[PDB]
Ligand binder design. Structure first.
Ligand SMILES: CCCCCCCCCCCC(=O)N[C@H](CCCC)COP(=O)(O)OCCO
Ligand SMILES: CCCCCCCCCCCC(=O)N[C@H](CCCC)COP(=O)(O)OCCO
Ligand SMILES: [Ca+2]
Ligand SMILES: [Ca+2]
Ligand SMILES: [Ca+2]
Lengths: 119, 119
């Protein structure tokens, strides 16, 4: 679920403030997304968007509100192998996005980008 | 989900082995259940069974496989207020049983009861 995602980013990147750092970044980070990703981080985002999109293909699979089971044995995220298909899928989308964010450059010039004009 | 319930009992009762301890106890503790519960513990089990049985009123709610968000505060069990309706409901069933088990006498003679004759 969305609340669990927030925490998972914290696991992977301990000194992050997910809502402040990751939301409203590039053309894709945050609710919605269009155009071409401005950079590496943005692409991380667009791939999560698309990951969620493939999920709404599992019957009754709603990514924003589907709670799964996961753990953090520090910086390392583990998706419970016991999650149902839907929960598993979504956990993967989230885990991947978290690791992707942790390994990508962060351009301050892309934070709160003018989407109507650069997207 | 079932795997989470196992951990949920261990939390309310640290020295327990839920699967070896409560499964196949009385008339109701384990898959299925019938007759009149032989004891207090047995009564905790019937109640959990019927809690689940109700869950199947909510749309697309599968008690055995729906994973929720919860945590163990050192004995104390907390179901995340962020759970969706189906998750929250199932979390509660589970939490109430764990607490129930905590408080009920355990009768070793009620273990592996001859169901076919006593239930
Ligand atoms: C909610 C707080 C959790 C942490 C958020 C911080 C960064 C989120 C950006 C990641 C990509 C994105 O925009 N993913 C979204 C989820 C985040 C919503 C704000 C996918 O959902 P979106 O509807 O944009 O795409 C779905 C359709 O494909
Ligand atoms: C299996 C996971 C770890 C095992 C924990 C030990 C069993 C504890 C039983 C508690 C009551 C019960 O019987 N509750 C059950 C589920 C747990 C045992 C399978 C309700 O499920 P049941 O199908 O009996 O009833 C369904 C609705 O009537
Ligand atoms: Ca998005
Ligand atoms: Ca769930
Ligand atoms: Ca039962």
């Amino acid at each position: 679920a969305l609340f669990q995602f927030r925490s998972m980013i914290k696991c992977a990147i301990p000194g992050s403030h997910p809502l402040m750092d990751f939301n409203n970044y590039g053309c894709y980070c945050g609710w919605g997304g269009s155009g071409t990703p401005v950079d590496e981080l943005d692409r991380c985002c667009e791939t999560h968007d698309n990951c969620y999109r493939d999920a709404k293909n599992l019957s009754g699979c709603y990514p924003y509100t589907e709670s799964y089971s996961y753990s953090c044995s520090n910086t390392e995220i583990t998706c419970n192998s016991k999650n149902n298909a839907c929960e598993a899928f979504i956990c993967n989308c989230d885990r991947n996005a978290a690791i992707c964010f942790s390994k990508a450059p962060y351009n301050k010039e892309h934070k709160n980008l003018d989407t109507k004009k650069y997207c």
